[PDB]
Amino acid sequence: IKVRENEPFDVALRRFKRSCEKAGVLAEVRRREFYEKPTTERKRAKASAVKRHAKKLARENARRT
Template identity: 65%
Template sequence: MPLVRLRDNEPFEVALRRFKRICEKTGVLSEIRRREFYEKPTSVRKRKAAAAVKRQQKRTSMERNRYTRPNY
């Protein structure tokens, strides 16, 4: 859990903003949303496999675009 300490004469709103930024960077909120409901192990495997396929397609697309000339 991210921890934010109030500095001398620091307004609460500034500390709250820092806390929100830290939570966003560490992915706490997305992790909570992901774990909100039980996900079956088969669903987890299926989601991870789909993400891997999507990453691979994106990588091959980027490589293909890198070696082709732009049509200006």
């Protein structure tokens, strides 16, 4: 997070923040995530992942492209 960028540079470049926290503090601990709903919305994000990964193996179809 503590980003100096030497001296001649300035132009923000603080992906250190954006690829670390932000989403964790904000869109998660902003409003009430009802204990059960994570167990639901994770397991569907998790089921959607292997759905794509299993399909990616069988994605090599005829195509003709």
